[PDB]
mmCIF file with all atom_site columns, C-alpha atoms in Angstrom:
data_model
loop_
_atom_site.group_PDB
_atom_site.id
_atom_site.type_symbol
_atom_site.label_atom_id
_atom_site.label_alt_id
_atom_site.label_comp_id
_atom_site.label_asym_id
_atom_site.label_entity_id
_atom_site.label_seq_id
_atom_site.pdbx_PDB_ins_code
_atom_site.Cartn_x
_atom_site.Cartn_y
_atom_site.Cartn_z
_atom_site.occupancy
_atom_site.B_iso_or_equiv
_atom_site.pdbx_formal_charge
_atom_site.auth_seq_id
_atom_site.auth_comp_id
_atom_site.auth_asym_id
_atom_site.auth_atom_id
_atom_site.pdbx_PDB_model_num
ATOM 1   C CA . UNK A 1 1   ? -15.662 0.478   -12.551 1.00 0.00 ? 1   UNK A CA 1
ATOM 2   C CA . UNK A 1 2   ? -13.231 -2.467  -12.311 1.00 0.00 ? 2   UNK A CA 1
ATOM 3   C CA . UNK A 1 3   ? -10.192 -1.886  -14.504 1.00 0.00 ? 3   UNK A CA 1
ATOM 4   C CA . UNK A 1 4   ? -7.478  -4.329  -13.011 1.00 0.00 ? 4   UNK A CA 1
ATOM 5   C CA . UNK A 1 5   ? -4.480  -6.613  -13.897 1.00 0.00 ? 5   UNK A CA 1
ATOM 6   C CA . UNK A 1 6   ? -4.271  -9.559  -15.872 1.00 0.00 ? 6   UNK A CA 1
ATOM 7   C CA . UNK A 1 7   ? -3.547  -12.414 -13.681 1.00 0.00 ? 7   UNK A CA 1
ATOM 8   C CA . UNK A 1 8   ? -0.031  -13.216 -15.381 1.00 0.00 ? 8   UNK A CA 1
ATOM 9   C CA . UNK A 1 9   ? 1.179   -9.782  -14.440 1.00 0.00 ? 9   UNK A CA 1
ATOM 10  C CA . UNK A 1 10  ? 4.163   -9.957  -12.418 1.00 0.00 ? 10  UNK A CA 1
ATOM 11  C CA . UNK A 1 11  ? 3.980   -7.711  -8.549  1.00 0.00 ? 11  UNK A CA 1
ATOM 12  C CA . UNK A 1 12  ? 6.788   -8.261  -5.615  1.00 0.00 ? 12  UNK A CA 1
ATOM 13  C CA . UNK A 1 13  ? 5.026   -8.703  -2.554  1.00 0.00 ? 13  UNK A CA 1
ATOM 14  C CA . UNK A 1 14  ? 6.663   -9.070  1.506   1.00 0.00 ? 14  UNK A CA 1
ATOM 15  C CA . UNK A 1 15  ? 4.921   -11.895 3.052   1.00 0.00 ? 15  UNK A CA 1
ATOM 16  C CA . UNK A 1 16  ? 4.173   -11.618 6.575   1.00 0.00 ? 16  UNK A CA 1
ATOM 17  C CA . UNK A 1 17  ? 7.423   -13.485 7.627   1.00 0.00 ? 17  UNK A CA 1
ATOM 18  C CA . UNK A 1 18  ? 9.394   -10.545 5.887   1.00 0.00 ? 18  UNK A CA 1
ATOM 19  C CA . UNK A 1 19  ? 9.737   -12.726 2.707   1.00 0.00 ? 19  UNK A CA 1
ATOM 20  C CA . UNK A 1 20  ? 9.950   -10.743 -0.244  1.00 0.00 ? 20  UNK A CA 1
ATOM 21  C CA . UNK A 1 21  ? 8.473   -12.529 -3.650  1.00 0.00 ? 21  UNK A CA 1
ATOM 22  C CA . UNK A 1 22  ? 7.985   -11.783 -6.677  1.00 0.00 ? 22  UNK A CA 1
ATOM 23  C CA . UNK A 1 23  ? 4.733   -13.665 -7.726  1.00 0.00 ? 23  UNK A CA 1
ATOM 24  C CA . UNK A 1 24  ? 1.320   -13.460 -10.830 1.00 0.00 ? 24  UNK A CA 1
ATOM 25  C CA . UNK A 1 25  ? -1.416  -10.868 -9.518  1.00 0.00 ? 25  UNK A CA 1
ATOM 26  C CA . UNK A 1 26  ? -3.620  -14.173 -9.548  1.00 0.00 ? 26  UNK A CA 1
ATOM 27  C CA . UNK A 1 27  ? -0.795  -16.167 -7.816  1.00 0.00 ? 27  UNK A CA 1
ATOM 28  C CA . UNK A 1 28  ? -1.373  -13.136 -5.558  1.00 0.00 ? 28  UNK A CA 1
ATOM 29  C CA . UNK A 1 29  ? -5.360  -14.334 -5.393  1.00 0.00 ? 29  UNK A CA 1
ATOM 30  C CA . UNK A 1 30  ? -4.377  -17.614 -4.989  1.00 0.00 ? 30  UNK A CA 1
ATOM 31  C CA . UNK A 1 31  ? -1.949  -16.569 -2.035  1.00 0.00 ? 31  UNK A CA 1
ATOM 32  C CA . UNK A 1 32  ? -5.420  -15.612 -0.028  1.00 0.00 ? 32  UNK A CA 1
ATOM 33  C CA . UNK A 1 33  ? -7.657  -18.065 -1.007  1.00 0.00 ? 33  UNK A CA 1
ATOM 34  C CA . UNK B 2 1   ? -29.169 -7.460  -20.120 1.00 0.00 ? 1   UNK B CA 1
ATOM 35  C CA . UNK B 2 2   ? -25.549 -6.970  -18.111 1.00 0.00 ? 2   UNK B CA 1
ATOM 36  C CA . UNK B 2 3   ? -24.264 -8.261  -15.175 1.00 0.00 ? 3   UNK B CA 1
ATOM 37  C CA . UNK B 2 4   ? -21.178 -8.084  -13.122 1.00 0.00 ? 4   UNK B CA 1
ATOM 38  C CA . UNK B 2 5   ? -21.433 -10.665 -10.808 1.00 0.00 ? 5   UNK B CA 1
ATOM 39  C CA . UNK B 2 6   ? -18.645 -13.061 -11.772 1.00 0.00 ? 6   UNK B CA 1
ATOM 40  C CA . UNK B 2 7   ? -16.418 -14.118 -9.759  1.00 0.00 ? 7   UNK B CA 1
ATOM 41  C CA . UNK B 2 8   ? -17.528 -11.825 -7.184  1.00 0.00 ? 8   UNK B CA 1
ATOM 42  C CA . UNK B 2 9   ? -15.439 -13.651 -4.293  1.00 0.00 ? 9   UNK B CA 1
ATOM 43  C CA . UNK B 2 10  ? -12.535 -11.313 -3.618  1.00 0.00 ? 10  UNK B CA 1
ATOM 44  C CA . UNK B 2 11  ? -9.975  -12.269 -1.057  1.00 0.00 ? 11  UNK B CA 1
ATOM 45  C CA . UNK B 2 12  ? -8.678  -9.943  2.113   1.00 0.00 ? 12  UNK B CA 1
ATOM 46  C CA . UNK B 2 13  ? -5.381  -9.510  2.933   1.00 0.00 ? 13  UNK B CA 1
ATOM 47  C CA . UNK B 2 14  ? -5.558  -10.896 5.946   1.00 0.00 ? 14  UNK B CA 1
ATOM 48  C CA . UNK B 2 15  ? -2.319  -12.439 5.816   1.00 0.00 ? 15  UNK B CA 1
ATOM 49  C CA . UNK B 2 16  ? -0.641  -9.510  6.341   1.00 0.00 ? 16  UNK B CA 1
ATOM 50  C CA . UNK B 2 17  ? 0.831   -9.380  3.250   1.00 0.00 ? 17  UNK B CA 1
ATOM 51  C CA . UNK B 2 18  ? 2.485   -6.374  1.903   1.00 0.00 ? 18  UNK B CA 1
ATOM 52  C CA . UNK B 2 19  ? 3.443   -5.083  -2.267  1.00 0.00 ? 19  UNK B CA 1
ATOM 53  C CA . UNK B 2 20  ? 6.742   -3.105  -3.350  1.00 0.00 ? 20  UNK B CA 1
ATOM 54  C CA . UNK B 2 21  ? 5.586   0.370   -4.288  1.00 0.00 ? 21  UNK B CA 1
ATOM 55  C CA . UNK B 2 22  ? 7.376   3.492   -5.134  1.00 0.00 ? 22  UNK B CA 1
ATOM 56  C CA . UNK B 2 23  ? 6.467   4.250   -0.944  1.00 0.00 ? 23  UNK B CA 1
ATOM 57  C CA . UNK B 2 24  ? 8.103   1.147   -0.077  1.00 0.00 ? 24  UNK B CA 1
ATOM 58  C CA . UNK B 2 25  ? 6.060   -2.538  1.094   1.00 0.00 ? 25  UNK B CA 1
ATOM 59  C CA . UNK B 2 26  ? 2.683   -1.191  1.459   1.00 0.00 ? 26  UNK B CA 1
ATOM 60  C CA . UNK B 2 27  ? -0.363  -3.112  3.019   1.00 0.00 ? 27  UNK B CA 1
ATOM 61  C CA . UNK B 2 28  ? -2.884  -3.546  0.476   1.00 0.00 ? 28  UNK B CA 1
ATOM 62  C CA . UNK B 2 29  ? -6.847  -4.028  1.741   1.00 0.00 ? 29  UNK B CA 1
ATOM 63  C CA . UNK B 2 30  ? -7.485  -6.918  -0.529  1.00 0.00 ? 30  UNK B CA 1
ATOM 64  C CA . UNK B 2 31  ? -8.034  -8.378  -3.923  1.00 0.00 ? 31  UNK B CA 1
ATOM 65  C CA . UNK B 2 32  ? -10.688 -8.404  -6.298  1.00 0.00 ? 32  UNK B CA 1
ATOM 66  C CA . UNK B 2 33  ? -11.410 -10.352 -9.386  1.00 0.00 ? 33  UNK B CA 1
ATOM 67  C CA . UNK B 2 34  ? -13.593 -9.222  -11.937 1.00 0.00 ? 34  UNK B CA 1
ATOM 68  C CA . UNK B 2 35  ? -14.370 -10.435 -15.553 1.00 0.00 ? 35  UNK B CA 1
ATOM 69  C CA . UNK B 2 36  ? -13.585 -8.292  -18.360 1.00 0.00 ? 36  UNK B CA 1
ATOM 70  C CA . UNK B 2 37  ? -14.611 -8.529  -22.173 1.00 0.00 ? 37  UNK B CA 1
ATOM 71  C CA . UNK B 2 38  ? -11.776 -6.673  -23.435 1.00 0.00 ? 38  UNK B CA 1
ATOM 72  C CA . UNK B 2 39  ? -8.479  -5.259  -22.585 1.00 0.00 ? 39  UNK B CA 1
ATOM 73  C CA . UNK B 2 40  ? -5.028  -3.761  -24.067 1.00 0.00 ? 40  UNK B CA 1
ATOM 74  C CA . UNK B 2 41  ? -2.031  -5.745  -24.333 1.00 0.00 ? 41  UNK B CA 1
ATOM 75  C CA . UNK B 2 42  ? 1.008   -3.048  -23.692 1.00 0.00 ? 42  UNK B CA 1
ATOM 76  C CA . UNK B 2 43  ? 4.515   -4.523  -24.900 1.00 0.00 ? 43  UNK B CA 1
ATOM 77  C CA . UNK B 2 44  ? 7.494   -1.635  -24.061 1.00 0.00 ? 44  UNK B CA 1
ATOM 78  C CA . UNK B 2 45  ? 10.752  -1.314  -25.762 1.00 0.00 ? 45  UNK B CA 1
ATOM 79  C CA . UNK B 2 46  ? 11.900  -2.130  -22.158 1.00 0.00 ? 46  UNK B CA 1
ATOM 80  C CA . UNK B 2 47  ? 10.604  -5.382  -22.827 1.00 0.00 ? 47  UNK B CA 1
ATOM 81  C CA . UNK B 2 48  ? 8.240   -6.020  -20.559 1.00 0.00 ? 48  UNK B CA 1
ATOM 82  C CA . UNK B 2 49  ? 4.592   -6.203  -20.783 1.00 0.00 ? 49  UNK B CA 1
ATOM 83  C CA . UNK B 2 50  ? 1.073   -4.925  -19.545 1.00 0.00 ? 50  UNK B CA 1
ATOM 84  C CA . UNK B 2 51  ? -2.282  -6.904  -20.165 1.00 0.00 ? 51  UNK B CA 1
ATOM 85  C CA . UNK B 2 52  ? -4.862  -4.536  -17.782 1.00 0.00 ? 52  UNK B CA 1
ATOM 86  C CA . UNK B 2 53  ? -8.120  -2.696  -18.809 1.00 0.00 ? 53  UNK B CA 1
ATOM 87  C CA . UNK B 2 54  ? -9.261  0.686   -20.721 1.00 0.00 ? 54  UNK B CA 1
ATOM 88  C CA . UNK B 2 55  ? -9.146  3.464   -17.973 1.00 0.00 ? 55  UNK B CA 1
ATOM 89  C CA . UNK B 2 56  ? -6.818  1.610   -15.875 1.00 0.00 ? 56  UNK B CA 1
ATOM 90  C CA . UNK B 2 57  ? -4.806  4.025   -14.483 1.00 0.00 ? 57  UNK B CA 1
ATOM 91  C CA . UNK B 2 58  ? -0.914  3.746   -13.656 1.00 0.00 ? 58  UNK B CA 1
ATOM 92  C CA . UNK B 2 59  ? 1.497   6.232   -12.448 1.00 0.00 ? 59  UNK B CA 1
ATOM 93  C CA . UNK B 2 60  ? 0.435   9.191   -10.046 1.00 0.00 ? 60  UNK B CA 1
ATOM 94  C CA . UNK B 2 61  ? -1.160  11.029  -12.993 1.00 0.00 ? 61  UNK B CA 1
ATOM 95  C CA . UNK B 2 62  ? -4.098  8.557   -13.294 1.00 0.00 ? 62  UNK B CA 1
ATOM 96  C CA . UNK B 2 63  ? -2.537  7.677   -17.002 1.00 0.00 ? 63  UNK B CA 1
ATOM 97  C CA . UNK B 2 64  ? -4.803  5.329   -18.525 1.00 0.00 ? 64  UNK B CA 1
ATOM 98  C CA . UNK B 2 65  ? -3.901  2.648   -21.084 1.00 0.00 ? 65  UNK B CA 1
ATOM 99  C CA . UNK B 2 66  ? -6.279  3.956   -23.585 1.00 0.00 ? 66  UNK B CA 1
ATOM 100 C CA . UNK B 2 67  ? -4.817  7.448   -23.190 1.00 0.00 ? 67  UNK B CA 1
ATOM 101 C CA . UNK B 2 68  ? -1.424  6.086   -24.257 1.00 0.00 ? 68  UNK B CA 1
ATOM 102 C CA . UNK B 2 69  ? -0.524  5.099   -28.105 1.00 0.00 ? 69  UNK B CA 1
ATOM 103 C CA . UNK B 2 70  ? 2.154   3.517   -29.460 1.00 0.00 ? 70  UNK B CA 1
ATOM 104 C CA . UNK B 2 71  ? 5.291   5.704   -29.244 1.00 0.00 ? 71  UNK B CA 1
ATOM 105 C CA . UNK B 2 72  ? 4.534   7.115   -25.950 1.00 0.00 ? 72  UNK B CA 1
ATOM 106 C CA . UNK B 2 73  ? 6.689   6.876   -22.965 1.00 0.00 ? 73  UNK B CA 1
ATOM 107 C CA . UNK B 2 74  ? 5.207   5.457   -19.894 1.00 0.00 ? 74  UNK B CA 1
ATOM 108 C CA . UNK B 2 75  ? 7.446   5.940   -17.346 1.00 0.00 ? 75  UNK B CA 1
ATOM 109 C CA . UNK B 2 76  ? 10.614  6.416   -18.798 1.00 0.00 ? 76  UNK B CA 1
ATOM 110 C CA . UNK B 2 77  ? 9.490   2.833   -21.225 1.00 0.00 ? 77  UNK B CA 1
ATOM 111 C CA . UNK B 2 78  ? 8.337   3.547   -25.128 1.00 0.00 ? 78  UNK B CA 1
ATOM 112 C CA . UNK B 2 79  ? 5.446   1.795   -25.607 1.00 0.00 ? 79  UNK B CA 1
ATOM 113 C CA . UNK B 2 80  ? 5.678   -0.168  -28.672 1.00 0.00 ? 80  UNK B CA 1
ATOM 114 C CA . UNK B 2 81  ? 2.666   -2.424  -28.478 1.00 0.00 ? 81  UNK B CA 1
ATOM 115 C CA . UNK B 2 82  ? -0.750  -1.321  -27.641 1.00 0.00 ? 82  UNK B CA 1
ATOM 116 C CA . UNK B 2 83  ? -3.862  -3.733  -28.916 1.00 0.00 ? 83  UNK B CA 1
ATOM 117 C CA . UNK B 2 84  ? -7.165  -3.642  -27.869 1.00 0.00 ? 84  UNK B CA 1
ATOM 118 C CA . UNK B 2 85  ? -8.246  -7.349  -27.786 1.00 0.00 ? 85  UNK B CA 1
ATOM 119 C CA . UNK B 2 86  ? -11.804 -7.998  -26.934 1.00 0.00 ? 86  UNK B CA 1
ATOM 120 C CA . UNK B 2 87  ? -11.698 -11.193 -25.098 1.00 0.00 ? 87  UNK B CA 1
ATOM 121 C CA . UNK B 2 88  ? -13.216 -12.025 -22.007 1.00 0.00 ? 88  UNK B CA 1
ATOM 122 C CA . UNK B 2 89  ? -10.643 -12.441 -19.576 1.00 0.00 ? 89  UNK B CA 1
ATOM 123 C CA . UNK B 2 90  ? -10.134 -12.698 -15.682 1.00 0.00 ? 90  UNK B CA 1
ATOM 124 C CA . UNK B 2 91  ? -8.428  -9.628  -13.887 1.00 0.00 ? 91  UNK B CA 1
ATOM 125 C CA . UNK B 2 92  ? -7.214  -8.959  -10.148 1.00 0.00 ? 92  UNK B CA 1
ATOM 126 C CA . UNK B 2 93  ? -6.637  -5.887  -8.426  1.00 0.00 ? 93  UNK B CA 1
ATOM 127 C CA . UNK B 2 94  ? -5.279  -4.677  -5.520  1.00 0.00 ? 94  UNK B CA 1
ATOM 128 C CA . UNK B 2 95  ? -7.457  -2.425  -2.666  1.00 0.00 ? 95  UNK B CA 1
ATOM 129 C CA . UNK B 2 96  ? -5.886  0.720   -0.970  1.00 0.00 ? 96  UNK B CA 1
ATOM 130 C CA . UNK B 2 97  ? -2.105  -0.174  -1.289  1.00 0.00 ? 97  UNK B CA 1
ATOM 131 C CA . UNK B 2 98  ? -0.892  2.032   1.607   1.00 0.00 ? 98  UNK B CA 1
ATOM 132 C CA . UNK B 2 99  ? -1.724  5.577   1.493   1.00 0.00 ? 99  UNK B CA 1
ATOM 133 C CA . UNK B 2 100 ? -0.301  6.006   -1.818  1.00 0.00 ? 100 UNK B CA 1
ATOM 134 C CA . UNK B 2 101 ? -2.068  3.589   -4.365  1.00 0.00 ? 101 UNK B CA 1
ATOM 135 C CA . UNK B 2 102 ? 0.391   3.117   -6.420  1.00 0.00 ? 102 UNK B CA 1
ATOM 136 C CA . UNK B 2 103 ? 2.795   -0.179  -6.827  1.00 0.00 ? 103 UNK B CA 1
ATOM 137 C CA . UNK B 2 104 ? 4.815   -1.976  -8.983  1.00 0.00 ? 104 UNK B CA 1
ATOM 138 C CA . UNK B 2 105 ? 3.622   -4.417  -11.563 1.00 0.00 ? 105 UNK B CA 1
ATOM 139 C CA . UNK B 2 106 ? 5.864   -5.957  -14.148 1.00 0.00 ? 106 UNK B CA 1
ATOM 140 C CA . UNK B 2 107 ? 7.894   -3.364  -13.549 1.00 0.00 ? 107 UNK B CA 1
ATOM 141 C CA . UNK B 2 108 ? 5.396   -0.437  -14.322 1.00 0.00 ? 108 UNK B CA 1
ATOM 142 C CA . UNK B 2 109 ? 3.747   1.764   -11.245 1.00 0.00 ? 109 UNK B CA 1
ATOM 143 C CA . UNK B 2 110 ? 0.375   0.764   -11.545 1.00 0.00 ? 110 UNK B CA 1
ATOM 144 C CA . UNK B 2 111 ? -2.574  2.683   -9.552  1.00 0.00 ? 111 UNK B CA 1
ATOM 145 C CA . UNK B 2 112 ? -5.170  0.481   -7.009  1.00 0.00 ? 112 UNK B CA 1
ATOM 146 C CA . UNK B 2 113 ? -8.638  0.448   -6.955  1.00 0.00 ? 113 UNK B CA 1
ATOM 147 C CA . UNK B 2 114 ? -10.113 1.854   -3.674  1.00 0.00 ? 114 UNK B CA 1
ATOM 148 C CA . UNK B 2 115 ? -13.182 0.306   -2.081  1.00 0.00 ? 115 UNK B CA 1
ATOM 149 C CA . UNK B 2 116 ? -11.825 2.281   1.407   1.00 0.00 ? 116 UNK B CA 1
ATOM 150 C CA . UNK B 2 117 ? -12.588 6.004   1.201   1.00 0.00 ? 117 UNK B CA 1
ATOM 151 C CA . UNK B 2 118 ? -16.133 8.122   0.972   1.00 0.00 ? 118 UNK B CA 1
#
């Protein structure tokens, strides 16, 4: 139905500059508020 | 009697932002947040963590973190620690990563939600 992530859980993302990152899944949220 | 209607922003990637998978820096759709009452707090002999909920599923083989018990090996990491704690916490997920739906998180393949596909 849902079944996610808590927020503190660690991903590595590439930004849109080519920046890799390693940020929280709610950092992540927070990213594209 | 239920609802699940909190926090029912979610955020689109429309920042073109991309996640490490096991296909490489995949474009995810978005990100939704959702409420949950309960979820299982993974701890691996590797060290690392997992705090996610029931029938999430992680690697390819839609392995759920109620399916796994303490002693099993999730990708190549024993899991020592596996509590269900029923408190009511906020989660995120990630939409359609690629074409794969699977990607990295605390350095466990974890599979995506999809709200893309029929």
């Amino acid at each position: 139905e849902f079944e996610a992530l808590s927020g503190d859980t660690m991903i590595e993302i590439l930004d849109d500059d080519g920046i890799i990152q390693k940020i929280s899944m709610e950092d992540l949220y927070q990213r594209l508020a | 009697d239920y609802k699940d209607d909190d926090d029912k922003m979610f955020k689109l990637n429309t920042k073109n932002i991309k996640v490490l998978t096991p296909s490489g820096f995949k474009s995810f759709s978005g990100i939704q947040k959702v409420y949950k009452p309960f979820y299982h707090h993974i701890i691996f002999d590797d060290g690392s963590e997992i705090k996610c909920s029931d029938n999430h599923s992680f690697g390819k083989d839609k392995i759920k973190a109620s399916t796994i018990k303490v002693g099993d090996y999730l990708q190549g990491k024993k899991v020592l620690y596996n509590e269900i704690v029923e408190e009511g916490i906020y989660l995120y997920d990630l939409l359609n990563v690629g074409e794969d739906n699977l990607y990295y998180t605390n350095g466990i393949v974890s599979h995506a939600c999809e709200s893309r596909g029929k």
